[PDB]
Amino acid sequence: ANNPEDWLSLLLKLEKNSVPLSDALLNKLIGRYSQAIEALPPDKYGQNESFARIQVRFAELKAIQEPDDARDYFQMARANCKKFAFVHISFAQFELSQGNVKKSKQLLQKAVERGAVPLEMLEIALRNLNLQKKQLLSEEE
């Protein structure tokens, strides 16, 4: 039961059950994500897609709850789950949303250089960044 897949399921369910979201419910959800991260050693889960999702969701929620403090959580996810393109792109999306366009591009280029996968997701993100779109990946992409 202490595995990322079971944790991710519980966390997605909690969020589904918390709609319509309030400040109070969001704080509770963020607290539960932290509890998952306290329970899952990153060492054995560096290539685990659910663990990567847990960390990215935590960073993305912190970007809502505390955007001026959220950078380190994206750095955390990237340090722990570097193989996944979606992790780098989430970080790049955060930097872009903060107006940090050059940083967003640097992050995406470094992911490509380091062979994060799938490459096509990175190429789409770089395309949209160059077109100056607000979202590196559309909801439909």
Curated annotation (Swiss-Prot):
Where Phosphoserine occurs along the chain?
Answer: S22
Tissue expression profile of the protein: Present in rapidly proliferating cell lines.
What interactions and quaternary structure are annotated?
Answer: Interacts with TPR; the interactions occurs in a microtubule-independent manner. Interacts with MAD1L1 and MAD2L1.
> What this chain does, per the record?
Involved in mitotic spindle assembly checkpoint signaling, a process that delays anaphase until chromosomes are bioriented on the spindle, and in the repair of incorrect mitotic kinetochore-spindle microtubule attachments. Phosphorylates MAD1L1 to promote the mitotic spindle assembly checkpoint. Phosphorylates CDCA8/Borealin leading to enhanced AURKB activity at the kinetochore. Phosphorylates SKA3 at 'Ser-34' leading to dissociation of the SKA complex from microtubules and destabilization of microtubule-kinetochore attachments. Phosphorylates KNL1, KNTC1 and autophosphorylates.
Please state which protein family the record places this protein in: Belongs to the protein kinase superfamily. Ser/Thr protein kinase family.
Its recorded name reads Dual specificity protein kinase TTK
Name the source organism: Homo sapiens (Human)
The coding gene here is TTK
Q: Please state which portion of the whole protein this structure contains, as first and last residue out of the total length.
A: 59 to 199 of 857
